[PDB]
Design a protein around this nucleic acid. Structure first.
Lengths: 50, 50, 124, 51
RNA sequence: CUGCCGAAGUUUCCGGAUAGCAGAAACUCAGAUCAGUUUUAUGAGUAUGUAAAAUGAGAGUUUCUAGUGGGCCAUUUUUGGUAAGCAGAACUGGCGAUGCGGGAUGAACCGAACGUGAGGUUAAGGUGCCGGAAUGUACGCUCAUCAGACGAAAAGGUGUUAGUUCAUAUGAACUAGCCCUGGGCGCUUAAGCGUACUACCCAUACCUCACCGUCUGGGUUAGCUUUGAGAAGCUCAGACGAGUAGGCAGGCGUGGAGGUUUGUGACGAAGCCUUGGGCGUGAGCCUGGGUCGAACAGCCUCUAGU
RNA sequence: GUACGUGAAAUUGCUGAAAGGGAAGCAUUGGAAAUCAGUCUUACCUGGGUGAGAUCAGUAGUCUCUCGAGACUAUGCACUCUGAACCUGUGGUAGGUCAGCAUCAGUUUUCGGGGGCGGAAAAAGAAUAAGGGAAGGUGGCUGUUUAUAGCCCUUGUUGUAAUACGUCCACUGGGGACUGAGGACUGCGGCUUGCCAAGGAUGCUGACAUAAUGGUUUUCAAUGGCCCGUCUUGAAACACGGACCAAGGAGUCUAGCAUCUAUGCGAGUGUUUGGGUGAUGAAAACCCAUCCGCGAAGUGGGAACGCCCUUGUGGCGUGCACCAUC
């Protein structure tokens, strides 16, 4: 889960394939759910959060 | 973000060790401990579109 | 900045080498049962937009300049500001009286001429 | 922005940007120092060593 | 000439009016709905339909308007068959509009569906030589004096291999496998067959990058010394790329006309020739040299015996 | 040179070069030979000397615009300027193709080293204090039981063993290949204003350039490559058309109708049957008298807007087009 997100991680930002090269990309698209960084995205995926 | 990342890594280590300790206790006591099924599944497509 | 050409061979019309009546200029094969249209193996290539060259280096000569056709001295003076992007090309119908005056003018302007030594000799 | 994608698992500088926690990780931590008690009762061994 | 969309090949009534398929326009919506989806449960009879959880995608229209309005093969289902085959329907997709790797070769088989390329990695199939890749490893089976390799076929075998079982070290009855009888060169403790495990080969497939185009989403004016306002420009980002009928867009070329280039030309127009050079994905265009001898062209628009 | 402007293609003769076992044949990649583009250092910077002259004068006039802006004229060449000519500089700095290396970035491939954890907290095993047993039996003698060899099982045993395997390290050391897109600065980070492997390649060198790099033609080698169009047909099979080249050669004009777009005006709209007029072509353009043709004949949702005010959220109103309700 960690290596796939770090090397092949690409967000769907406004119907576009935007790589997760910055935490502000994930925060701008998943900040509504208290997800702010890439390790928070990994944590949600790995532990299957709410 | 750094504090959140440290907490996640601490949670992973504790969750892995407790699984090991539970299995060790069941093995010593002679009982059988079945780990919980996983909620996360990584699916890869192997056949083409034809 | 180097000019990259995706292809240098021209696209010849199919079966243009078997008949003199069929010219080399590319014609799209309309035959349905034609192997060239269906793009089999060993069949020739066809003009596709994929072969299109880089926009930045399009129309550029191998020396990095774009050709500008010149018919008189007034045309060559337009390239005062664009002498590092364009090369003067004197037209084929411009006489030798004007070819010499274009070449001398293009020399002071710092403009390359692609055919500057045409229809003239030298006298040192 | 982002002309070229850099892998955090190879570029340490990009990893430090993405994860402000790699500077203090301590990947290898000694757990079993000097105890290592063999935990396998005779009941488990008999069931395992069967047939 | 290029680019972008792109079917259907058939329900239904009956040559048709429909519809379906594919586009155009105007509408209302993403806090709305939808699905060759999977469930849950209600019932009803392992399935079934209905109603209400997961997953994915913003959805629903209205109007009018091109083409199709054959089948083949294959799968499954099938009813009777009936020398045996088969025939008959139905069910479902693929091809028909479609190239590519393998399959000796081949249109139905195995992979895979296509912009132009560099590198990497694979699929199917392969690695003795033709042929890219182990004359690889570990077990066995097979001797053919037609193997194998890619119906007389059932069986017989003083034919084997492993043998089992039962009788008292042997014999009988048996249990199967293989042989005998009934693509090329070549291979035989295989380069055959079966199993297991490493390595290796390469497709237009997959990944990373560059470039082309299209589509989509943005940004850009008290036009700031970043000057990049042909705003019809400039710029940023992502995805995508087969294609018949047909739909749509932008371009190339020809004769003549209005305007324009204060245009070219006897110091050589037009034309033609050329293993001269260049530009464009292409239609095409520019140019050197030779030949030649009087006219001719670029740009905006108009026109057609183009 | 009357076989007469230009003189294409098919076709023919000669000459030269190359190739050639029962086709040619084209494509892809290179070689060879022939033949081309295809280019160069030459300028910048900084002087000093010398003289030169105006856009320079502690200068005088004229002309055209409008004081001062251009054009000149006379004089000076002192002040400024002219990278201004030359002498003196021997000062500096030096672009195109092809190569080598280094430091990097993206991608990738291939060898290692170290460590954590898990597995019966590996199984074994050694060491090892014992007990028991039998063997395919040592000694004694096939049978036999540690001897004059040992083995197996069990506990014990050092122990918290080691190793293998699995998994993990934001642990680390090399080798190879392919790419370098973008073009002031912005950002996210790491170090300590600065620095950096952090929103995409730069350094250090050479040689050749005056050949290399390429390109073209011919030809060879390797690999591939069934004849085009039409009709047929799932598909092909087919059957047709094709000796070769040049020129000609097929959705045109017009009347009506309907959709759509553009343009003009708009309850209107349309000058060209005709009349007026038009001296520079007068079949144009321009003007319009009377007709006539065609047209005319309340409640909900909602675009858009204002006001708020817990401010976003929502609410309060005004509600086009259009669709539902009376």
């Amino acid at each position: 889960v960690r290596e796939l997100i770090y090397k092949r991680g690409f967000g769907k930002v406004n119907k576009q394939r935007i790589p997760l090269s910055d935490n502000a990309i994930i925060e701008a698209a998943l900040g509504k759910y208290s997800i702010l960084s890439v390790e928070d995205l990994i944590h949600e995926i790995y532990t299957v959060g709410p | 973000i750094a504090k959140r990342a440290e907490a996640y890594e601490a949670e992973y280590r504790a969750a892995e060790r407790e699984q090991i300790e539970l299995a060790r206790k069941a093995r010593a006591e002679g009982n059988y401990f079945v780990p919980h099924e996983p909620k996360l599944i990584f699916v890869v497509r192997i056949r083409g579109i034809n | 900045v180097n000019i990259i050409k995706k292809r240098t061979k021209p696209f010849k019309r199919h079966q243009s080498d078997r008949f003199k009546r069929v010219g080399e200029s590319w014609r799209k094969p309309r035959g349905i049962d034609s192997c060239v249209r269906r793009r089999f193996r060993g069949t020739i290539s066809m003009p596709k937009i994929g072969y299109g060259n880089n926009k930045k280096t399009r129309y550029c000569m191998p020396n990095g300049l774009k050709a500008f056709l010149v018919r008189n001295v007034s045309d060559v003076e337009l390239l005062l500001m664009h002498n590092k992007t364009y090369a003067a090309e004197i037209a084929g119908n411009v006489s030798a009286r004007k070819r010499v005056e274009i070449v001398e003018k293009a020399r002071a302007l710092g403009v390359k001429v692609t055919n500057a030594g045409a229809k003239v000799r030298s006298q040192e | 922005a982002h002309v070229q994608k850099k892998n955090p698992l190879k570029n340490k500088a990009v990893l430090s940007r993405l994860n402000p926690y790699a500077k203090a990780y301590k990947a290898n931590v000694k757990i079993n120092s000097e105890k290592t008690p063999k935990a396998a009762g005779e009941k488990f061994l008999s069931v395992l060593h069967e047939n």
